[PDB]
Design a protein around this ligand. Structure first.
Ligand SMILES: C[S@@+](CC[C@H](N)C(=O)[O-])C[C@H]1O[C@@H](n2cnc3c(N)ncnc32)[C@H](O)[C@@H]1O
Ligand SMILES: [Zn+2]
Ligand SMILES: [Zn+2]
Ligand SMILES: [Zn+2]
Lengths: 159, 247
């Protein structure tokens, strides 16, 4: 299953990779604009088919809350993540993390979607809703994705 | 069930598998390119919906008169298909003379029936390119090539005076003495790359007395396919067995 990352958002994925991997920066946690807020904003943008949009939002939340700590983190981010778990247990990841990591989710979710118990028509509907949400992210890219949400990791972090 | 159910059997295991995040190379290549050369600016130009005539007017001298095309009684099917005589002399029908009326599909350029699923993307060694987000069938009218219609004298003047700091080159030959120059003004067609094995082609049509160029699909293309045509000194990176080496 091929999920299509909007062409406008790929330079931001490059920037995210640069900030985390080269410049050794970290996204501000807890996120000031968390994944829950973004999903709520999208659900409200759609209702301005309601049960369908809410199902997509719930599914994105579930997949993110399973995948954030497993597949959505650069290695340099692992300590911070552990820190978060220590500081705010029982807080779901959709409440702690923000837009860059939710975007990272769609780079890897397509591999998982091939094992969902849906037929061809429903899988096409799901891909439709997912690409709709992705272009919603692309429309609001100016407010959602920004290097100003990243900060230099302190020397304490590097050990 | 559900609209977005979780993955079953081996999908649960793969979803819960710990794997350090890796940016795919079809995105990460941009970073190395931005380090070797600069991050490309947003390509700016004056977007126009119709050609702009500078010092020439590309008149064709042909008034499109009626054909013998049959107007389908079923309003579902289009009128002027492959056997239209106007279409066969590469002239679009006129709305005042066509027997098929508003069912005629030989007015695609003048009705601006552009394909609306094109997208500008970054191609590794070719810069900006145009891809189609939906599938296209052969012979489909895709888009019109727009720009400033200039004489070869005007184009040479422009190349002497302001296209000396340019590494691309944005023009179609409308004639042996007229050119459609899309350096400054045009549409998305100015981003379509060259190929030695093209999937599209440019066709010159007589549309209500003036010549206009349109890009038509040479063969079927699935979604995500980059549009190319044969431009007719740059190293060619089209990547095709029996490539001419140079554009
Ligand atoms: C009309 S522009 C096409 C859009 C261009 N890629 C851009 O970034 O704006 C033509 C230019 O694109 C580049 N180009 C087009 N086709 C190419 C190809 N097949 N291989 C290498 N470069 C190509 C050449 O530099 C050429 O001067
Ligand atoms: Zn006809
Ligand atoms: Zn007709
Ligand atoms: Zn070639």
């Amino acid at each position: 299953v091929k999920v299509k990352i909007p062409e406008e958002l790929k330079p931001w994925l490059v920037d995210d990779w640069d900030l985390i991997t080269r410049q050794k920066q970290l996204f501000y946690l807890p996120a000031k604009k968390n994944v829950d807020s973004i999903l709520e904003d999208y659900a409200n943008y759609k209702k301005s088919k309601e049960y369908a949009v809410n199902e997509v939002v719930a599914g994105i939340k579930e997949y993110f809350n399973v995948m954030l700590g497993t597949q959505l983190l650069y290695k340099f981010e692992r300590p911070q993540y552990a820190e978060i778990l220590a500081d705010h247990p029982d807080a779901p990841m959709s409440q702690v993390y923000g837009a860059p990591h939710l975007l990272r989710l769609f780079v890897r979710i397509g591999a998982m979607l091939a094992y969902t118990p849906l037929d061809e028509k429903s899988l096409a509907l799901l891909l439709n809703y997912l690409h709709d949400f992705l272009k919603y992210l692309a429309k609001n890219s100016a407010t959602l994705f920004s290097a100003s949400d990243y900060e230099v990791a302190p020397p304490e972090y590097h050990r | 069930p559900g609209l977005f159910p979780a993955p079953i059997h081996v999908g649960k295991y793969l979803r819960q598998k710990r794997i350090d995040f890796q940016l795919p190379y079809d995105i990460l290549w941009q970073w190395k390119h931005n380090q070797l050369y600069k991050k490309p600016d947003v390509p700016l130009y004056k977007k126009i919906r119709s050609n702009v005539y500078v010092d020439v007017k590309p008149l064709s001298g042909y008034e499109a008169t009626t054909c013998n095309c049959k107007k389908p009684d079923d309003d579902t099917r289009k009128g002027c298909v492959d056997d239209c005589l106007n279409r066969m002399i590469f002239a679009e029908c006129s709305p005042n003379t066509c027997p098929c009326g508003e069912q005629c599909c030989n007015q695609r350029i003048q009705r601006h029936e552009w394909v609306q699923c094109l997208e500008r993307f970054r191609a590794e060694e070719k810069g900006w390119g145009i891809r189609t987000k939906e599938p296209l069938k052969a012979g489909q009218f895709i888009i019109e090539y727009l720009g400033e219609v200039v004489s070869e004298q005007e184009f040479r003047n422009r190349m002497i005076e302001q296209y000396h700091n340019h590494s691309d080159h944005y023009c179609l030959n409308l004639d042996s003495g007229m050119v459609i120059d899309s350096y400054r003004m045009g549409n998305e067609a100015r981003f379509i790359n060259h190929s030695c094995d093209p999937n599209c082609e440019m066709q010159k049509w007589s549309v209500n007395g003036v010549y206009r160029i349109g890009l038509y699909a040479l063969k079927d293309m699935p979604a995500g396919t980059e549009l190319t045509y044969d431009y007719n000194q740059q190293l060619c990176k089209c990547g095709f067995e029996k490539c001419r080496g140079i554009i």
